[PDB]
Every structure is written in C-alpha cells, then in structure tokens.
Amino acid sequence: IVGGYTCGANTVPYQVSLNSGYHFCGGSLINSQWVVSAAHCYKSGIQVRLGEDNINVVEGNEQFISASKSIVHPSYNSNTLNNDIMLIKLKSAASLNSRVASISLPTSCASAGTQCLISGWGNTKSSGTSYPDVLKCLKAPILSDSSCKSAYPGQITSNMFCAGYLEGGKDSCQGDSGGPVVCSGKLQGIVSWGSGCAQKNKPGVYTKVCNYVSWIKQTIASN
Ligand SMILES: N=C(N)c1ccc(CNC(=O)[C@@H]2CCCN2C(=O)CCC2CCCCC2)cc1
Ligand SMILES: [Ca+2]
Asked: In this protein, which residues make up the domain named Peptidase S1?
C-alpha cells in the first residue's frame, strides 16, 4: 500500500496473509472455513495466516491453517486477469474472535464515489521497493467506470472496477494482491492489477466481487 497508514493491530480482522514459506498474497475471510483471494495468487501448498499484524513476528493472536483445496474461477483468464478470484478452503475451521472475523459478501454492488478500505502488506513505495511488516490501510473511492476505461483502454471488463486517486500518490501495490477492498461493510473488491503503483492516471484495478456472490455461495455449499 503506497501512501496509506498503519492500520493498527487486528483492526482489519478479515485480512489474511497467504504464506508458502513467505507472505505472497492477501485474502479475505468470508466464514470460518473459506477465504477469498485473487486467482493470480493461485499456487499449491498454501497456509492461511489469520489474526496477523506484524507478519514477521509472532504477537499472540495468529492462527496458521493449511489450505485443503483451492478453486480458481472457472473463467479466469491469466492473460487479461478477467475473473481474477479464487476460493481457498481451510483444512480446519478458524476459531472466530474479535481479531479473526469474517467480512460480509455484498448483496449488491457499490456505486462510484463510495469510499472503501484497502489493506495489505505489499510494497509502500511508488518507485523502488520497501515492504512493511505491519498491515497498511488506505481509504480510497471507487472511480467512475469511464475514468477507469480511459486509463486502461480495451483492458477493463464488467468484472473489474478502479479505485483510488487519479492524481497518484495513494494506491495498492505488489504484495497486496488478493486482499480486500471493503465498502460499507461489504467485500466489494480484490486487489488485482494496475500500471505501476500510485502513478498519475493509473489507478488500481479490482475484481468486482458483487458479480461473483452467487458463484461463491454455490461453490462453498458444494465443497
Ligand atoms: N493498484 C496497483 N497499482 C497494483 C496493485 C497490485 C498489483 C499486483 N498485480 C500484479 O502484479 C498482476 C499479477 C499478474 C500481472 N499483474 C500485473 O499487474 C501486470 C499487468 C497486468 C497483466 C495482465 C492483465 C492486466 C494487466 C499491481 C498493481
Ligand atoms: Ca504475526
């Protein structure tokens, strides 16, 4: 997260870290058994890390649980990142508590101009590289689809939306991949892609979760 702030420990209790010997993506807890992340975060051998603040220090509220299965959206296209969403099942249910909590799925989408919260452990510099070890937060509005498509012609689909600031300076970035965009208490986006990070007229692009709620609900009920 570029241009954001330190969230504070466990203030984003639905935020998970996916680990395969190291953090490599964010995700969101949607109930005690299931996490939502980006399809581009798919790999085998995932451990889900819940209750994290400093991801390099054991602070006392963590739960580390291996994934039993991963389910990439059946229409994910790795070339365009259309349908960039996947479901991860925990081999054992998480113990839910005030530091380890689920985020609600949308019943409807959110409108442009709605303020959201974006969070993660990704890069904090817009040029170069620095990784934080505590969770970072960013308040960011949903942008109009026309500003989104103008920035990225021919690349935006109806499964994507942009959020952030066209003047630059504040954005998500590498290593925030897969993590949440929460608006009005609902998971509306997943950190997916963008050109650089926090660059002028290059806002972030997020998977449009409200398009996937029926898929999510049917998939978890059958797996
Ligand atoms: N908001 C941002 N600025 C931002 C946030 C997170 C990320 C991380 N995502 C990535 O690195 C993703 C994974 C695969 C290629 N990729 C890219 O962004 C490269 C550009 C992609 C390539 C595929 C189709 C759309 C453009 C990239 C940018
Ligand atoms: Ca920790």
From this structure: 1-221
Way it was determined = X-ray
Q: Residue 15: CB partners within 8 Å, gap ≥ 6? A: 26, 27, 28, 52, 119, 120, 135, 179, 180
d(CA 10, CA 100): 8
Q: What are phi and psi of 40, to 5 degrees?
A: -75, -10
The residue with tokens 């689909």 is 157
Residue whose CA lies nearest to ligand 1 atom number 8: 174
Return all residues near 35 (Cβ < 8 A) that are at least 6 apart: 16, 18, 27, 28, 29, 48, 87, 88, 89, 90
Edge-first strand order for the sheet with 115-120 is: 5-6, 136-141, 115-120, 180-183, 186-193, 204-208, 160-163
Atom of ligand 1 nearest to the CA of 197: 3
- Single-letter amino acid, residue 119: S
Out of 84, 102, 176, 192, which one is annotated catalytic? 84
Q: Which domains are assigned to the chain? A: 1-12+103-210 (2.40.10.10), 13-102+211-222 (2.40.10.10)
For residue 112, count CB atoms less than 10 angstroms from its CB and return exposed for 0-12, middle for 13-18, buried for 19 or more: middle
Handedness of CA 32, 38, 42, 45 (dihedral sign): negative
Known catalytic membership, residue 84: yes
| Cα angle 206-118-170, degrees, rounded to a multiple of 5 | 90
Resolution in A: 1.7
Q: How many Å lie between the centroid of ligand 1 and the Cα of residue 143?
A: 18
* 167 annotated ligand-binding residue: no
